[PDB]
Design a protein around this ligand. Sequence first.
Ligand SMILES: O=C(O)c1cccnc1Nc1cccc(OCCc2ccccc2)c1
Length: 210
Amino acid sequence: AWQARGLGTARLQLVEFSAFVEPPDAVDSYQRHLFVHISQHPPLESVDVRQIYDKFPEKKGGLRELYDRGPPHAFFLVKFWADLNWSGGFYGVSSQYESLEHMTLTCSSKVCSFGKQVVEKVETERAQLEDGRFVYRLLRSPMCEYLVNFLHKLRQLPERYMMNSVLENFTILQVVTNRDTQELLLCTAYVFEVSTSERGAQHHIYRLVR
Ligand SMILES: O=C(O)c1cccnc1Nc1cccc(OCCc2ccccc2)c1
């Protein structure tokens, strides 16, 4: 009855999320290539979280501990089929959330390889009042150089199944918390495959249950 139908909770809803590259010539005629993209402008299916425990960090800030803090309804798994056909351009990530209440968000994004945290980015965004609800805009964050280099290497692999093998061990954990109260608002686990290109980016969102 109170089961999510999109990625978010009654406190904080994902509006839009994308990762993209704009070619250097974008200044002349604009174009951006979307690696992955969620736009949220029946209940979702569910995946038991224990199955994905070892794809993410441990001991602290890991999935089990986070799920242990709660709240359980705030945990989502997103599977992406990334579009890897698109050098020297701008690699960016854009996130947008909204809420009924005014908070200061802290958003932590962790890239893990074989479950070991490899890179982490932490950002805060203060609410902006706008049309009844509050909007949080973390737009055009530069991709970190580890991911850009990873994408350039990945795009070079001679077989799609080889990119999928490599991506089997690559995950991203995103945890959004109330900066002031420390309460977790949204935790999203991302897992990745490569899209055949022809099909651009796709995704499938699941609730994480236990
Ligand atoms: O923004 C950053 O530097 C950043 C830093 C630390 C952690 N996470 C970050 N961002 C982020 C979050 C979620 C997805 C995403 O990229 C999808 C592209 C992609 C990557 C690999 C295989 C296929 C497709 C980027």
